[PDB]
Automatic annotation (TrEMBL):
Keywords: Methyltransferase, S-adenosyl-L-methionine, Transferase. It comes from Salinibacter ruber (strain DSM 13855 / M31). This is RNA methylase family UPF0020. Residues 27-86 form the Methyltransferase domain. GO terms for biological process: methylation. It comes from the Bacteria. One of its GO terms (molecular function) is protein-lysine N-methyltransferase activity. Pfam families: Methyltransf_31. SUPFAM superfamilies: S-adenosyl-L-methionine-dependent methyltransferases. S-adenosyl-L-homocysteine binds at T7, E53, D81, L82.
Length: 155
Protein backbone atom coordinates (compact mmCIF):
# COMPACT_ATOMS: atom_id res chain seq x y z
CA UNK A 1 0.00 0.00 0.00
CA UNK A 2 1.49 3.32 -1.14
CA UNK A 3 1.26 6.05 1.54
CA UNK A 4 0.61 9.75 0.84
CA UNK A 5 4.06 11.27 1.40
CA UNK A 6 4.76 13.70 -1.46
CA UNK A 7 7.85 14.24 -3.56
CA UNK A 8 9.66 17.44 -2.44
CA UNK A 9 9.13 20.32 -4.90
CA UNK A 10 12.80 20.63 -5.88
CA UNK A 11 12.87 16.90 -6.69
CA UNK A 12 9.71 17.36 -8.78
CA UNK A 13 11.51 20.08 -10.78
CA UNK A 14 14.47 17.77 -11.43
CA UNK A 15 12.08 14.93 -12.57
CA UNK A 16 10.44 17.24 -15.09
CA UNK A 17 13.83 18.41 -16.42
CA UNK A 18 15.01 14.79 -16.70
CA UNK A 19 12.00 13.89 -18.89
CA UNK A 20 12.53 17.04 -21.06
CA UNK A 21 8.91 18.03 -20.46
CA UNK A 22 7.57 20.77 -22.78
CA UNK A 23 4.36 22.41 -24.01
CA UNK A 24 3.59 19.52 -26.43
CA UNK A 25 3.48 16.90 -23.67
CA UNK A 26 0.60 15.17 -21.89
CA UNK A 27 2.07 14.14 -18.55
CA UNK A 28 0.44 11.36 -16.48
CA UNK A 29 1.25 11.15 -12.78
CA UNK A 30 0.19 7.71 -11.52
CA UNK A 31 -0.75 8.18 -7.85
CA UNK A 32 -0.97 11.95 -8.11
CA UNK A 33 -1.47 12.95 -4.44
CA UNK A 34 -1.85 16.74 -3.98
CA UNK A 35 -1.28 17.23 -7.74
CA UNK A 36 2.15 18.89 -7.50
CA UNK A 37 3.82 17.00 -10.38
CA UNK A 38 1.10 17.76 -12.93
CA UNK A 39 0.61 21.31 -11.61
CA UNK A 40 4.31 22.17 -11.84
CA UNK A 41 4.52 20.56 -15.32
CA UNK A 42 1.69 22.89 -16.42
CA UNK A 43 2.97 26.03 -14.69
CA UNK A 44 6.68 25.72 -15.62
CA UNK A 45 6.56 23.92 -18.98
CA UNK A 46 3.01 24.53 -20.27
CA UNK A 47 2.33 20.78 -20.52
CA UNK A 48 -1.13 19.23 -20.23
CA UNK A 49 -1.46 16.87 -17.24
CA UNK A 50 -3.55 14.02 -15.92
CA UNK A 51 -3.28 12.82 -12.34
CA UNK A 52 -4.74 9.42 -11.37
CA UNK A 53 -5.44 9.12 -7.62
CA UNK A 54 -7.38 6.57 -5.58
CA UNK A 55 -8.10 8.72 -2.47
CA UNK A 56 -11.05 11.10 -3.05
CA UNK A 57 -9.76 13.56 -0.39
CA UNK A 58 -6.53 13.98 -2.38
CA UNK A 59 -8.38 14.34 -5.70
CA UNK A 60 -10.33 17.21 -4.01
CA UNK A 61 -7.13 18.83 -2.69
CA UNK A 62 -5.40 18.53 -6.08
CA UNK A 63 -8.31 20.13 -7.97
CA UNK A 64 -8.27 23.03 -5.46
CA UNK A 65 -4.49 23.31 -5.90
CA UNK A 66 -4.78 23.44 -9.70
CA UNK A 67 -7.45 26.18 -9.55
CA UNK A 68 -5.33 28.20 -7.10
CA UNK A 69 -2.27 27.76 -9.40
CA UNK A 70 -4.19 29.07 -12.43
CA UNK A 71 -3.60 25.81 -14.40
CA UNK A 72 -7.05 24.14 -14.27
CA UNK A 73 -7.34 24.56 -18.08
CA UNK A 74 -4.20 22.36 -18.51
CA UNK A 75 -4.64 19.78 -15.68
CA UNK A 76 -7.24 17.05 -15.02
CA UNK A 77 -7.57 14.63 -12.09
CA UNK A 78 -9.29 11.26 -12.27
CA UNK A 79 -10.36 9.35 -9.17
CA UNK A 80 -9.43 5.70 -9.63
CA UNK A 81 -6.94 2.87 -9.35
CA UNK A 82 -3.83 3.49 -11.50
CA UNK A 83 -3.69 -0.25 -12.34
CA UNK A 84 -7.04 0.08 -14.11
CA UNK A 85 -6.47 3.45 -15.84
CA UNK A 86 -6.19 4.14 -19.57
CA UNK A 87 -2.77 5.79 -19.82
CA UNK A 88 -2.20 5.36 -23.58
CA UNK A 89 -2.43 9.11 -24.33
CA UNK A 90 0.52 9.86 -22.03
CA UNK A 91 3.65 11.31 -23.65
CA UNK A 92 5.50 11.25 -20.27
CA UNK A 93 4.77 9.21 -17.12
CA UNK A 94 5.92 10.01 -13.56
CA UNK A 95 5.87 7.75 -10.51
CA UNK A 96 6.53 7.83 -6.75
CA UNK A 97 5.15 4.53 -5.57
CA UNK A 98 7.03 1.50 -4.08
CA UNK A 99 9.47 -1.16 -5.36
CA UNK A 100 6.84 -3.90 -5.46
CA UNK A 101 4.22 -1.59 -7.05
CA UNK A 102 6.67 -0.48 -9.77
CA UNK A 103 7.31 -4.15 -10.59
CA UNK A 104 3.57 -4.85 -10.93
CA UNK A 105 3.08 -1.72 -13.04
CA UNK A 106 5.93 -2.44 -15.51
CA UNK A 107 4.03 -4.76 -17.86
CA UNK A 108 1.14 -2.27 -17.99
CA UNK A 109 3.59 0.45 -19.11
CA UNK A 110 4.86 -1.85 -21.87
CA UNK A 111 1.26 -2.68 -22.92
CA UNK A 112 -0.07 0.89 -23.10
CA UNK A 113 2.72 3.42 -23.77
CA UNK A 114 4.09 4.45 -27.16
CA UNK A 115 7.76 3.73 -27.92
CA UNK A 116 9.90 6.72 -26.99
CA UNK A 117 7.75 7.63 -23.96
CA UNK A 118 9.88 8.66 -20.95
CA UNK A 119 9.07 7.17 -17.56
CA UNK A 120 10.50 8.92 -14.47
CA UNK A 121 10.49 7.39 -10.99
CA UNK A 122 11.37 8.92 -7.64
CA UNK A 123 13.54 6.55 -5.50
CA UNK A 124 12.35 3.15 -6.82
CA UNK A 125 13.71 1.27 -9.82
CA UNK A 126 12.15 -1.23 -12.28
CA UNK A 127 14.17 -4.33 -11.42
CA UNK A 128 16.02 -5.81 -14.41
CA UNK A 129 14.75 -3.11 -16.79
CA UNK A 130 17.86 -0.90 -17.00
CA UNK A 131 17.36 2.88 -16.67
CA UNK A 132 18.66 5.44 -19.22
CA UNK A 133 19.52 7.86 -16.37
CA UNK A 134 20.00 7.74 -12.61
CA UNK A 135 20.30 11.11 -10.84
CA UNK A 136 21.74 11.22 -7.34
CA UNK A 137 20.30 14.09 -5.33
CA UNK A 138 21.05 14.79 -1.64
CA UNK A 139 18.77 12.17 -0.02
CA UNK A 140 16.78 11.23 -3.18
CA UNK A 141 17.34 9.27 -6.40
CA UNK A 142 15.52 9.81 -9.70
CA UNK A 143 15.44 7.23 -12.50
CA UNK A 144 14.48 7.60 -16.13
CA UNK A 145 13.60 4.97 -18.72
CA UNK A 146 12.46 5.30 -22.31
CA UNK A 147 9.86 2.84 -23.62
CA UNK A 148 11.66 0.83 -26.32
CA UNK A 149 10.46 -0.11 -29.84
CA UNK A 150 10.68 -3.79 -28.82
CA UNK A 151 10.28 -5.10 -25.27
CA UNK A 152 13.51 -6.90 -24.28
CA UNK A 153 12.83 -10.68 -24.31
CA UNK A 154 13.93 -10.83 -20.62
CA UNK A 155 10.88 -8.63 -19.71
N1 LIG B 1 -3.64 1.93 -6.78
C1 LIG B 1 -3.54 3.28 -6.72
N2 LIG B 1 -4.10 4.06 -7.70
C2 LIG B 1 -4.00 5.40 -7.62
N3 LIG B 1 -3.40 6.11 -6.65
C3 LIG B 1 -2.84 5.31 -5.69
C4 LIG B 1 -2.89 3.94 -5.66
N4 LIG B 1 -2.24 3.48 -4.54
C5 LIG B 1 -1.82 4.56 -3.93
N5 LIG B 1 -2.16 5.69 -4.57
C6 LIG B 1 -1.82 7.09 -4.21
O1 LIG B 1 -0.44 7.29 -4.58
C7 LIG B 1 0.08 8.45 -3.89
C8 LIG B 1 1.55 8.24 -3.46
S1 LIG B 1 2.37 9.67 -2.78
C9 LIG B 1 3.02 10.39 -4.27
C10 LIG B 1 2.20 11.60 -4.73
C11 LIG B 1 2.76 12.36 -5.95
N6 LIG B 1 2.93 11.52 -7.17
C12 LIG B 1 4.10 12.96 -5.59
O2 LIG B 1 5.13 12.47 -6.05
O3 LIG B 1 4.18 13.91 -4.80
C13 LIG B 1 -0.88 8.67 -2.72
O4 LIG B 1 -1.55 9.93 -2.86
C14 LIG B 1 -1.83 7.47 -2.75
O5 LIG B 1 -3.16 7.72 -2.28
CL1 LIG C 1 -10.30 17.66 -12.69
CL1 LIG D 1 19.67 12.55 -21.07
MG1 LIG E 1 9.87 14.54 -25.36
Amino acid sequence: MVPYVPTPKPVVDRMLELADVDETDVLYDLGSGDGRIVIRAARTHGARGVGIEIDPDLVKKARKNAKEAGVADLVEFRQGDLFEADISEATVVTLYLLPSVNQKLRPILFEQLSPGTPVVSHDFDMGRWAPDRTVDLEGDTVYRWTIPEEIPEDL
